[PDB]
Amino acid sequence: TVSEAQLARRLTKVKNSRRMLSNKPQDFQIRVRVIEGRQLSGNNIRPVVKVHVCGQTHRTRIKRGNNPFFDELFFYNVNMTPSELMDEIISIRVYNSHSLRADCLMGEFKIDVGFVYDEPGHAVMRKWLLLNDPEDTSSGSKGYMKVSMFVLGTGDEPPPERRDRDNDSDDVESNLLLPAGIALRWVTFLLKIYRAEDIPQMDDAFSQTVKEDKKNLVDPFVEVSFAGKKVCTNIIEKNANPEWNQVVNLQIKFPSVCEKIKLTIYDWDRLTKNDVVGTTYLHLSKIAASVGFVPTFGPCYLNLYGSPREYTGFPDPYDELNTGKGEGVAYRGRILVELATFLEKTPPDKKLEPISNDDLLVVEKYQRRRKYSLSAVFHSATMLQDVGEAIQFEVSIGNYGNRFDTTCKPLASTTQYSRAVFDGNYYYYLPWAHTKPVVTLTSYWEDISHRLDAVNTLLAMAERLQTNIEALKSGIQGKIPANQLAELWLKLIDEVIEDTRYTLPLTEGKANVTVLDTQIRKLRSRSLSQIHEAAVRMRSEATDVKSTLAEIEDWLDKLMQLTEEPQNSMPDIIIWMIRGEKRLAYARIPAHQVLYSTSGENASGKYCGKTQTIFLKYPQEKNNGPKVPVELRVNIWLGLSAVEKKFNSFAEGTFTVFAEMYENQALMFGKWGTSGLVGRHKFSDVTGKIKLKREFFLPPKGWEWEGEWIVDPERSLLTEADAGHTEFTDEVYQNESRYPGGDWKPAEDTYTDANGDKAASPSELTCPPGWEWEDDAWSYDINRAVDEKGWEYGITIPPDHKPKSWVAAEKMYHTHRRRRLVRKRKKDQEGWEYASLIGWKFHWKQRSSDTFRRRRWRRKMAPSETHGAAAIFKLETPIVSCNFDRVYIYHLRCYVYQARNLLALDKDSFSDPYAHICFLHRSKTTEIIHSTLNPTWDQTIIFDEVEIYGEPQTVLQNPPKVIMELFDNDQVGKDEFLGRSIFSPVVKLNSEMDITPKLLWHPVMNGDKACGDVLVTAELILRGKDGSNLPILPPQRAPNLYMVPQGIRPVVQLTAIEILAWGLRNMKNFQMASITSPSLVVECGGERVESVVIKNLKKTPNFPSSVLFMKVFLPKEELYMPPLVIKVIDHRQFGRKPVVGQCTIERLDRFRCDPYAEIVDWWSKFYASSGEHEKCGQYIQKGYSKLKIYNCELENVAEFEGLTDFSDTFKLYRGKSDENEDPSVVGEFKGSFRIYPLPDDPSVPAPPRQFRELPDSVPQECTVRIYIVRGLELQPQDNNGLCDPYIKITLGKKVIEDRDHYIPNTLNPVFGRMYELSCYLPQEKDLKISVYDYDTFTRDEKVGETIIDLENRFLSRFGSHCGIPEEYCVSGVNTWRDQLRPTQLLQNVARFKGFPQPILSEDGSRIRYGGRDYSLDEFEANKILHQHLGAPEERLALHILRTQGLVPEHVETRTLHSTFQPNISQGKLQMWVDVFPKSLGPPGPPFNITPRKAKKYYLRVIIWNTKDVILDEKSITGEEMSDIYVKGWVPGNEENKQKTDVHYRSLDGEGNFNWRFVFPFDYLPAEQLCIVAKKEHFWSIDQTEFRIPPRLIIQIWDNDKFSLDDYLGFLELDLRHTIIPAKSPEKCRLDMIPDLKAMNPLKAKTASLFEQKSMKGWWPCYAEKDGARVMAGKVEMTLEILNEKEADERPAGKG
Ligand SMILES: CCCCCC(=O)OC[C@H](COP(=O)(O)OC[C@H](N)C(=O)O)OC(=O)CCCCC
Ligand SMILES: CCCCCC(=O)OC[C@H](COP(=O)(O)OC[C@H](N)C(=O)O)OC(=O)CCCCC
Ligand SMILES: [Ca+2]
Ligand SMILES: [Ca+2]
Ligand SMILES: [Ca+2]
Ligand SMILES: [Ca+2]
Ligand SMILES: [Ca+2]
Ligand SMILES: [Ca+2]
Ligand SMILES: [Ca+2]
Ligand SMILES: [Ca+2]
Ligand SMILES: [Ca+2]
Ligand SMILES: [Ca+2]
């Protein structure tokens, strides 16, 4: 249907804006202005409009008449998610008010905020609404509502108007918000709920143990939120697998749509609050496209994610994850839903229905389970932070694989407990080595492989395309020549051509195919055909690749939106690290990324059978913070169990399972024997409580025995033998214990190690052979979470014996203390383990007190040849571990060159950064660069002999991440976190790939924002038999300290940096003293230049010498350019020179340069330039000129470069920046830089200096004239929605406020006032202009604030100190206000631009300028030289000055910023500032911008006769006596209602009055509307000026001298669009007045009463009933209007 395609078009227009990044807090402001009502229903109504936006309802005050006018603007300040605001509704609803009764409903229109947010201009511009009654929508429209609604986000601005009458304010059929093609039909989404499964326990579970099934302790129901309405299903009592089967009939109207269906399962509770199970969403644009199709979805499961499944009686701290906020860390069950979009049948009361039985029969084919086998090979778990407890890894997909719900059979889906060992430098790692732990588990999910094959293939397409675009971007960035770019682009387009002929998998023959599957396959086929055809067109058409790069970037995002799959029913694989018995960290791998497909490798996942690197996160961290818990590399292979034999091609190594059998003995009389075993069996298990036998273990199907039963005492020796490192810092801990409140003493375990038990003293430590000590003494560590003495404290509570956590402070309840000691380094076995007690912890050697022993009696099982490595899935405790038969030796070199924009984490505004370079089980620390935020380490970090297991091609495909953690070194305390950069090294395996690695700026991520960048690269060379294939060692500037080699280091060249040290502004006090003697230091590339010291900053705010010069070596590449460092030093007594300010400038590309390169006043001028005033009282025809209205700031006009062309803006900072934001702005340095290369030898002369034409740096007194014109759409600061604004201007030490001349009760104030001050630039450059709300009995509110750099106005080359007008006048209201004549300004710009001095001709009609010649006739054409013009030479010299790109005479619209919403408009201030420095003379006469007074007007009407008025029903006399009397008034002046005398003996509508009405009113002919001033009520503080259009509403009325007043009709005349009357009453008939809703609208003949002053004719009055208009009669008028003097010329009576 036609409604289907336009709904799909609306949903795709929704789709192309649902891609902005959703900040969870975001301030928003919505301006809803109502303007004018038209054709409102009813008779003699009193219309009112109530607008409800986001729960806040505003209210315009009462008007009367069926065509009202309000012109009141409403503000809505909300704070919510930006995606949530586009689903909220704006409900503007019209009532008919009454004096003594409640308001009755008269109309309604609901439009969502989304439509006014995708609308161009970020808003809608005065569109008309189709008001309809919500319960009476079948009877047609009830009126029209001209509204203009706005959306202002953070950083957004509103657009200006454009002339407001040419296609606006009339013939409203061309100005609908929704045209006639958009129906008002309902859209009904049949959002069906079928069932749910695996819902976690949310009940107390103690009442069920009384009964003498425990997983079913939840009472779920579905709550669905959609456009604010909430529908809840029935409650299923005590069932974790509920069977709701209920349709939910969501309903919206076509004007107001909602995108985000929110499904939230809640656990119903009888007493307490309803718990949250999980929250998943439907996005309607993701399930729709535009040929196109409606939203369709399901039947498919949606997985819920949230809090961990462990039930606690206490409130779970991760319950915020259950509401959909955050990503969610654990599987919360899943719900089977369906969606269908219908457009008819609008079900009013059956919101909840049962599912029909045929739909239950259909849904069974989407519920079929398939067996899935998942394996995970844990390769390396490094970057650990503690050693206190053993670490386990659990793999679970869905509810399958949870190791805590022990009510069912455990699936053996977790590793065993591995205790980390120190890597020698900073971190820890689990010592897996050649024995990787393998986790195998079996789940059951629906076979939805027809979706995930397509998802994986299009994702592989997008990844190949992204790799080729990264190669092409490196090609264009590196200036690689054109033939290589042509070859790479041809390879790229060949990749696109070869890829996009891929056919999507067929939906035929598969039970799980939905309607959305067919529509998605059709859309994907159409998109792939379009991409393939456009690629085969462009491969033969296009030649330039930079033009096609933009289309290719669109193709990449098109491929990204093609991989979106809302029907991904496979839950994510969640890997949990369990330290002890507690959940610690999580990672969610999507199941499609590891799912195996038989359709090919592209249809399989990206990391299917490959060792991916994942960083775990803490359960409520949005990003990685100071501590990453563990970096985990794991080879995850998920697949169907029917094709699990294909796992053999992905498996590496040999999988190995061990049977274990334990025999115990004891010692008496010097001989070991079987006596004395009490409580533990002779043959038993690992715990000794369960008796086992050697014959109890037999291999299952697919396994076989390898070897014989052997003793295994070699577990102690084979734990890597500490041979993986050459430099190692050993660590020995010390432990003490005490009573609570007692004295400290050493414990029985006085010294511990990484084994978690007792060890030898530090004096007894000896090096192994091949090792030696670096230092002969130990030392304690301060760089941890400890106090100044290196001690941390813990508390023990029984029955626990040892602490589980430590803190840095000592309390009276702490019973343990621990200290870490470090020392650096360079370069029996009878088959039994012995312990002191039976069933105790056995040790590798017999101690003095050991009297019991045991041994391990184990046999190896190998997989058979008939099964391969797939036998690990057929075991279903067994332990499966993959053993690698060989090791590969690598060699990693990290070239850490420099860093930029690091955080200031010291009190002296800098840091001491160093880098922990970590790569698997190896780590090394770079040196510390002191007192900088932009270090240059210039260092190479070499990890010789790194053992990485697996084939070298798997390390080529998925290299391990090199993770660098930057830290601010502190001499005391703990070193603070700067950030973390994660990047991959380039991999080399032989000599044919020996290209030089390229340094790249990788981000230093702290929190969720990039706190700087680091220039670093790495390479990982595969070592052969020895180090011969490795490259040579880099040169050393220090022992064991390698320099970055010549190939990797950027090539430096000699280049000059010129610094314009102009001056310092707003220097705040440092150490409670003013900055009296500052200086500037500019450092770049290790070489600094220092300016002269200012003797007094208050007396002279500018440096005496403004030019600085330094020769530095900087890289030739613009990417490799180091940051520019500015430090402001303060010179104080006793030689003290602290740093009081610092800024980092990294965007140095803007600094590179080629060194060899009827009455007329000002409001007539203002209204003519706006364009809304024209062709009505215009003054352009007299030959005058206009001005340039800027819709933004003058510093936001791109023609003037932000007015920083002389010297830019750099804020200075100081001190530690908490919560990784920018530090406090304690000053400002003003200056600019010019960087240009230099010759290497002095034989070539130096390039010329770039700063030669500097102005004088002394302070100058300036006369600042601030002309403030008007304010536009200010934020209301009163309870009535209005404001009483005035102007408060602060300028240095002079503050001028105008509270005595405030403008009462306006949101659009006409200020029109001058505020002249004298300020000394640049000490008082901070011109702050603020608007303030007057309040009589309470505090004032700040409407807005803006800052103008007056020194930018003074010192710019664009002449922004005074805007040049288009004409040079010497009289009138357009008199030249600048101090300097246009000849002098032309001379100034000529000597500024390097042009020679301009020459006046012998007659003044030519001036030579800038190598060209100018004539008077070139600019004076098509203009009238009236009497106010000045000299012709100054005229043409001003005419030259307009073509120079200077600032014209302007009224800039400055944004009013406030702290209430920081980067959002709180109003606007049309104004301008002229700066007049006193050095070049006094300025001219100022402009008079005083607002013009409204001239008096007298409207006179005369009512001659009436005809065919509706007769009365029954009077006192008992006839058809309609006592006709005619009353009429100008609206706005309802207190001046005038009525005629009562006519009598009327039985046919005939009346005779000859009674005259007079209404005076104040009018502006320019703005074409009038003002009436009256108070709001008797207790209002001041009068309000109402700006309404001129019109005249006159109603026929039945007198009823002895009865009640009865209405007859009404008639309206807009005085600018007065309809042409008929010359005779019989020619007057119905519907020459405009009709808008009853029949197909036609424009009426109109003429202005102001232009055509008087005419006589007949006008029809009408009344409306039953939705139709009837003729209520005719009235004879002579409508005349006069001004004041014409009214005084001829007085009139009877009024
Ligand atoms: C022995 C248990 C007696 C339990 C007796 C009892 O009446 O418990 C009711 C509640 C738990 O019930 P909820 O449905 O709120 O749990 C839902 C859960 N809060 C959630 O957010 O998931 O317990 C407490 O408030 C305090 C329990 C303190 C238990 C020490
Ligand atoms: C609708 C009328 C209700 C009845 C009157 C009523 O409650 O008025 C409230 C206002 C609040 O003052 P503002 O108008 O500045 O509101 C400021 C604004 N809220 C803001 O955003 O800051 O006036 C007083 O309190 C004056 C008390 C004088 C006592 C002598
Ligand atoms: Ca509960
Ligand atoms: Ca419950
Ligand atoms: Ca509860
Ligand atoms: Ca610090
Ligand atoms: Ca420090
Ligand atoms: Ca106020
Ligand atoms: Ca006020
Ligand atoms: Ca107030
Ligand atoms: Ca009557
Ligand atoms: Ca009557």
Curated annotation (Swiss-Prot):
Q: Where in the cell is it found?
A: Cell membrane; Nucleus membrane; Cytoplasmic vesicle membrane
- Cellular component terms (Gene Ontology): caveola; centriolar satellite; ciliary basal body; cilium; cytoplasmic vesicle; extracellular exosome; intracellular membrane-bounded organelle; nuclear envelope
Give residues annotated as binding Ca(2+) 2: D213, D267, D269, D275
Q: Which cofactor does it need?
A: Ca(2+)
Residues at which Ca(2+) 4 binds: D1278, D1284, D1333, D1335
Name the job this protein performs: Calcium/phospholipid-binding protein that plays a role in the plasmalemma repair mechanism of endothelial cells that permits rapid resealing of membranes disrupted by mechanical stress. Involved in endocytic recycling. Implicated in VEGF signal transduction by regulating the levels of the receptor KDR.
Q: What is this protein called?
A: Myoferlin
- Which source organism does the UniProt entry give? Homo sapiens (Human)
